[PDB]
Amino acid sequence: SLFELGKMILQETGKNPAKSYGAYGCNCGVLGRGKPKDATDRCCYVHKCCYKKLTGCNPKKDRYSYSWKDKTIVCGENNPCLKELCECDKAVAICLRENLGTYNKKYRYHLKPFCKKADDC
Amino acid sequence: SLFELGKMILQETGKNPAKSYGAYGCNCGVLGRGKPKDATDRCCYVHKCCYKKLTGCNPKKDRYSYSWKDKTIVCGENNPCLKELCECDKAVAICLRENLGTYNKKYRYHLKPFCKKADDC
Provide the domain limits for residue A114.
1-121
Task: Name the amino acid, one letter, at B10.
Answer: L
What pairing do the DSSP bridges indicate for beta strands B72-75 and B66-69? Answer: antiparallel
Q: By C-alpha distance, which of A27, A25, A29 is closest to A17?
A: A29
Handedness of CA A62, B32, B89, B79 (dihedral sign): negative
Supply φ then ψ for residue B66, to 5 degrees: -150, 160
Q: Which of B3, B17, B29 sits opposite A18 (nearest CB)?
A: B29
Q: How far is CA A3 from CA A29, B26, B33, B71, B93, in A?
A: 14, 11, 9, 38, 26
Query: What's the CA gap between A53 and A66, in Å, rounded?
Result: 20
Q: By C-alpha distance, which of A40, A50, A41, A48 is closest to A97?
A: A40
Q: How was this structure determined?
A: X-ray
Number of domains in chain A: 1
Among chain A residues, CA nearest to B62: A31
For A1-102, strand residue ranges (E) read 23-24, 28-29, 66-67, 74-75
Q: By C-alpha distance, which of A63, A54, A62 is closest to A88?
A: A54
Interface test with B, best of A3, A30, A109 (most B CBs within 10 A): A3
For residue A91, give the CATH number of its domain.
Answer: 1.20.90.10
The answer to whether A54 faces chain B, any CB pair under 8 Å, is: no
